[PDB]
Scaffold this active site. Structure first.
Site, PDB file in Angstrom:
ATOM      1  N   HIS A   1      14.579  -9.254  -0.208  1.00 63.72           N
ATOM      2  CA  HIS A   1      13.223  -8.707  -0.176  1.00 63.72           C
ATOM      3  C   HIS A   1      12.271  -9.818  -0.662  1.00 63.72           C
ATOM      4  CE1 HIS A   1       9.795  -5.990  -1.378  1.00 63.72           C
ATOM      5  NE2 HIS A   1       9.982  -5.686  -0.107  1.00 63.72           N
TER       6      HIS A   1
ATOM      7  N   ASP B   1       8.792   2.962   5.302  1.00 66.23           N
ATOM      8  CA  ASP B   1       9.064   3.179   3.870  1.00 66.23           C
ATOM      9  C   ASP B   1       8.620   4.564   3.361  1.00 66.23           C
ATOM     10  OD1 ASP B   1       8.821  -0.229   3.542  1.00 66.23           O
ATOM     11  OD2 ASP B   1      10.343   0.842   2.382  1.00 66.23           O
TER      12      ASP B   1
ATOM     13  N   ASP C   1       6.490  -1.246   9.815  1.00 63.86           N
ATOM     14  CA  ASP C   1       6.358  -1.326   8.353  1.00 63.86           C
ATOM     15  C   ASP C   1       5.293  -0.336   7.841  1.00 63.86           C
ATOM     16  OD1 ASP C   1       7.070  -2.244   5.763  1.00 63.86           O
ATOM     17  OD2 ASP C   1       5.630  -3.885   5.826  1.00 63.86           O
TER      18      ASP C   1
ATOM     19  N   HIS D   1      11.779 -10.913   5.648  1.00 59.70           N
ATOM     20  CA  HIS D   1      11.665 -11.314   4.227  1.00 59.70           C
ATOM     21  C   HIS D   1      12.450 -12.575   3.800  1.00 59.70           C
ATOM     22  CE1 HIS D   1       9.131  -8.027   2.579  1.00 59.70           C
ATOM     23  NE2 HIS D   1       9.691  -7.300   3.529  1.00 59.70           N
TER      24      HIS D   1
ATOM     25  N   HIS E   1      10.952  -6.081  10.642  1.00 60.25           N
ATOM     26  CA  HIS E   1       9.486  -6.110  10.622  1.00 60.25           C
ATOM     27  C   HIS E   1       8.954  -7.517  10.301  1.00 60.25           C
ATOM     28  CE1 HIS E   1      10.853  -5.154   6.602  1.00 60.25           C
ATOM     29  NE2 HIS E   1       9.648  -5.300   6.082  1.00 60.25           N
TER      30      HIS E   1
ATOM     31  N   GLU F   1      16.699  -2.691   2.085  1.00 58.29           N
ATOM     32  CA  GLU F   1      15.812  -3.854   2.114  1.00 58.29           C
ATOM     33  C   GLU F   1      16.080  -4.791   0.931  1.00 58.29           C
ATOM     34  OE1 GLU F   1      11.653  -2.857   2.464  1.00 58.29           O
ATOM     35  OE2 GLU F   1      11.157  -4.756   3.435  1.00 58.29           O
TER      36      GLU F   1
ATOM     37  N   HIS G   1      11.290  -0.269  10.942  1.00 55.25           N
ATOM     38  CA  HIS G   1      11.115  -0.167   9.486  1.00 55.25           C
ATOM     39  C   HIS G   1       9.967   0.765   9.069  1.00 55.25           C
ATOM     40  CE1 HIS G   1      12.224  -1.926   5.541  1.00 55.25           C
ATOM     41  NE2 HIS G   1      10.973  -1.645   5.222  1.00 55.25           N
TER      42      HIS G   1
HETATM   43 ZN   LIG Z   1      10.198  -1.754   3.329  1.00 54.62          ZN
HETATM   44 ZN   LIG Z   2       9.215  -5.423   3.887  1.00 54.83          ZN
END
Ligand SMILES: [Zn+2]
Ligand SMILES: [Zn+2]
Ligand SMILES: [Cl-]
Ligand SMILES: [Cl-]
Ligand SMILES: [Cl-]
Ligand SMILES: [Cl-]
Ligand SMILES: [Cl-]
Ligand SMILES: [Cl-]
Ligand SMILES: [Zn+2]
Ligand SMILES: [Zn+2]
Lengths: 381, 381
Positions: B158, B22, B291, B200, B221, B131, B20
């Site tokens: 999430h 972002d 992450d 999550h 993650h 996500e 993961h």
């Molecule tokens: Zn993320």
């Molecule tokens: Zn996350």
């Protein structure tokens, strides 16, 4: 009959590629996109002008399946626009599921090479097109993702104006042709390799698009204005600009577009419209764009998808040469898709910049300062 | 150093695949998904923990790039839900444009075979995951189209509950695990070949998903609950059920998930979490799920994507064998994607029915009667 043998031979030599069919929307109307255990019905439908048995019977070589959704009617325009995007993904989904569950009949195609390979294998080359730029919810990002999902043409409008262009059937005019956004979208459609479709658009929107487009365009289902005056038909002005554009007008079977009285329309009228265009702008710029399942009833002799051999025989009977009939069947629309692909590879290879959406600022200045301070701390390590 | 040579050799023998990152959302925050003429900045970013120079420097073999959008905040839930779908297509678009404009560094991958072929060529295998199931706007059709766009995992939630499952960080509970829809979606995700991600999600949602899933799942993650108690970390109960599931827990670099005081977190803590899981449920069920760019600051020694060789060297230094380190780097997550693909081909080959959406009736009985009457007229010809 000798002409019926000749027509059958041609149908097996080259693919007849139809420009527009709304069978996916009939599946949404009848089955609600739930085709599990409905094979008997998909082969022999209780409604409509298209099913998988009659599709084989007519010897159709390829098809641009329409992923149409209606123009949004919600009083709130934000919700209606966003709803149309979700419905588009539902219609693209059921088209892909229809092709996947019937691999002996249908095979997915997104290019000239994939059309031929499908036709060699004895399958209907199944291409996809969306009918209206209301379907993208004003997102050029979404439009590029629709191209990735297999959409190979986009009708600029349906029966409603959008932010990009004017529809033919709605008055008053909004943009008087293409908007400033519309003009910029034409460049992006040429760059990505999306075939422009000028059916349903206004006469002025056609004229402007035909001058601007760097790739050849199509009319997926439109007829001739001089033979029958209608807002949906193509004028002699736009036919000549289509010739310069190197595009193709795919002739429609809609009865309202062929005759003044709808019940008088026939197979002979469709042939008159093909010959008119073929005589004036050459047979390399004419196609077949039925619009089957976009109507209740068809012309006399073109009542459903099983009737394509009668059209091929009718053209040969009137004195259109084999080579010219093959062009009208599918070679022309294959060429346009090939040229649209070549222009896209040309522009993408030259490093042309893509059209981006107008996105909101998501971070304030406080968040951006924390990020820059954090980056400089990492540089000092 | 000899261990630093050993770590470098391993990084070139097998791909380190991170679960993961972002970086696509940082591009939306900073550039607003407009990367035209921003190559200098994409290679050397003024913010964040990821850029293309540091990505090369850390010798990362592959990456699941996150196509995250925030949980909808609009008071009207219909608009917020539909807006999240459009934003998802924007984030998928910029990920594909990022890969396409930098083909020497990044190469798109959607399978075990495509990961390896990318790694042979010397590129970072670029996979995609969304996500949260808020991103699909309650459309299983949309979800299947996201799979076609290249999404290979879906985080079930999430930091917000949805119609399918409960998030960890929100109270009170809504479903108390998975909903009835959620349970039915697990079957559909297994059928289509979508990898389930349990990061999550709540502890009860994990337990239920781990028992139900016919394919192995991941935690893209997440860290260990026993070492550090947090709603986002994985309990010993769920670690054992992950072992039975044949899944992989990809360990997170989030400082809050590694220590009670966030500023105390380090590279050593990440290694403690990897060794804990590897000792108790075997090293074939542990991975790396940074992450990066989902946080402002990382642990001491794992500050950005250039720090992966220090992690590989740290694992070897603590006495984890070469073969076990290779498993944690990427062989495990490759295996899960391979098994997810094998289960999907198994179920699709057996003719399992797909989950369809609840669509509205669009035709009334008058329209359906006109269609049936019209079909019977055609039968009589
Ligand atoms: Zn993320
Ligand atoms: Zn996350
Ligand atoms: Cl050929
Ligand atoms: Cl003319
Ligand atoms: Cl109708
Ligand atoms: Cl191998
Ligand atoms: Cl345990
Ligand atoms: Cl942040
Ligand atoms: Zn249509
Ligand atoms: Zn139409």
């Amino acid at each position: 009959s000798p002409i019926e043998e000749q027509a059958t031979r041609l149908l097996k030599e080259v693919p007849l590629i139809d420009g527009h069919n709304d069978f996916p929307y009939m599946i949404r109307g009848w089955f609600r996109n739930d085709i599990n255990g409905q094979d008997a019905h998909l082969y022999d439908m209780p409604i409509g002008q298209t099913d998988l048995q009659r599709l084989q019977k007519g010897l159709l070589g390829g098809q641009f399946w329409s992923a149409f959704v209606p123009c949004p009617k919600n009083p709130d325009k934000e919700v209606g626009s966003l709803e149309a995007l979700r419905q588009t993904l539902q219609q693209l989904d059921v088209i892909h599921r229809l092709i996947e569950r019937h691999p002996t009949i249908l095979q997915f195609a997104d290019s000239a090479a994939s059309i031929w390979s499908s036709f060699r294998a004895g399958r209907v080359a199944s291409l996809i097109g969306i009918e209206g730029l209301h379907q993208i919810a004003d997102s050029v990002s979404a439009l590029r993702m629709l191209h990735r999902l297999g959409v190979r043409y986009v009708t600029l409008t349906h029966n409603c104006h959008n932010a990009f262009a004017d529809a033919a059937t709605v008055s008053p005019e909004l943009h008087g042709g293409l908007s400033r956004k519309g003009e910029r979208l034409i460049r992006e459609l040429n760059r990505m390799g999306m075939m422009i479709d000028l059916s349903h658009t206004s006469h002025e929107a056609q004229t402007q698009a035909l001058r601007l487009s760097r790739a050849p365009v199509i009319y997926s289902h439109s007829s001739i204005y001089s033979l029958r005056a209608h807002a949906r038909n193509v004028t002699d002005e736009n036919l000549h600009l289509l010739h310069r554009n190197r595009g193709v007008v795919m002739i429609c079977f809609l009865r309202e577009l062929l005759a003044s009285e709808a019940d008088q329309a026939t197979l002979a009228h469709v042939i008159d419209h093909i010959i008119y265009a073929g005589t004036r702008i050459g047979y390399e710029h004419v196609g077949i764009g039925s619009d089957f399942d976009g109507m209740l009833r068809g012309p006399d002799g073109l009542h459903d998808v099983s009737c394509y051999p009668a059209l091929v025989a009718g053209l040969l009977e009137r004195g259109v040469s084999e080579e010219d009939v093959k062009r009208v069947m599918g070679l022309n629309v294959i060429r346009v898709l090939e040229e649209v692909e070549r222009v896209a590879a040309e522009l993408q290879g030259a490093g042309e910049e893509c059209l981006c959406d107008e996105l909101d600022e998501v971070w304030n200045e406080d968040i951006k300062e924390q990020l820059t301070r954090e980056r400089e701390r990492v540089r000092k390590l």
